[PDB]
Amino acid sequence: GLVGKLVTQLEVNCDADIFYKIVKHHPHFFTGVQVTKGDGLVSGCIKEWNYVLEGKAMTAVEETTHADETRTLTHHITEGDAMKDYKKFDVIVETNPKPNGHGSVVTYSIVYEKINEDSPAPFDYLKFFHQNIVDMSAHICS
Amino acid sequence: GLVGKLVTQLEVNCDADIFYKIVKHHPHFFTGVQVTKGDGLVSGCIKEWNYVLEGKAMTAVEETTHADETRTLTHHITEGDAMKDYKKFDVIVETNPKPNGHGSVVTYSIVYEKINEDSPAPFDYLKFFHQNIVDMSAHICS
Numbered sequence A, B: 001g002l003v004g005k006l007v008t009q010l011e012v013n014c015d016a017d018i019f020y021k022i023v024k025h026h027p028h029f030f031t032g033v034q035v036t037k038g039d040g041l042v043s044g045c046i047k048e049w050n051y052v053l054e055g056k057a058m059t060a061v062e063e064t065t066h067a068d069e070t071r072t073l074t075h076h077i078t079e080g081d082a083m084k085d086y087k088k089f090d091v092i093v094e095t096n097p098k099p100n101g102h103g104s105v106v107t108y109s110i111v112y113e114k115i116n117e118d119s120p121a122p123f124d125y126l127k128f129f130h131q132n133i134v135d136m137s138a139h140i141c142s
Ligand SMILES: COc1ccc(C[C@@H]2NCCc3cc(OC)c(OC)cc32)cc1OC
Pocket: A027, A028, A049, A051, A052, A053, A060, A062, A075, A077, A082, A089, A091, A125, A128
């Protein structure tokens, strides 16, 4: 099966709307541009990343869009090392209140389509994104 | 955050109800028992597994339940190496038709609660369950 999705979901002790605003505004570096929607206000960005994953230097080009009303960030990868393995690679970050009312659930989903049946599934990316949100979440408190 | 869920979802070219029936009936071995519901018909099982994960021999005790009407298998781990890292570890396997009507989507979810913030998230288990369903899925065809 070539099409799949990997998910990591974590509970965080933080209001969903604030946490989303934190995530939205944030060896590696990027160059790139911001994207606007017509009113001159930034609606997203396009970045070329240089990063190291499990010791190997890689590049990617990522177009990011946000949806404030659903607290969703979407990172659409168009180019780079990952596209040697995947025809499609998108990363969707959602933040929602726990039905308990107070804290939040953060979901990172990697939606992918492999080039062929010999391509890996992106467990190395899932672990990276997971640890990154754990790390960010451990620099926040009430 | 101590509570989380890992998911791998895969598309399979197989009718959901047949695929669920295949999954339901299937270095490692197990000993154990079957569980009935009162009519003498098997409703589940309780197994003690001996298995090797990333080279290390481990044991677990797993109680499995099924739900035919939702094509869901639930594996509830009560004891074993994994419980050195997790207070709770459940594995839920769902099979549903693609809204396209024909093939299926198979979802393995690992629902976990870590013992403490230094416990790993179960990416090693997610990869194992993923490869196992890929392998099974590559022994089936129309
Ligand atoms: C192939 O997919 C991607 C590759 C890189 C990114 C960028 C991502 N954001 C912060 C900096 C950064 C740093 C990294 O390693 C140090 C990294 O590794 C995967 C990923 C990222 C994002 C990606 O998709 C969201």
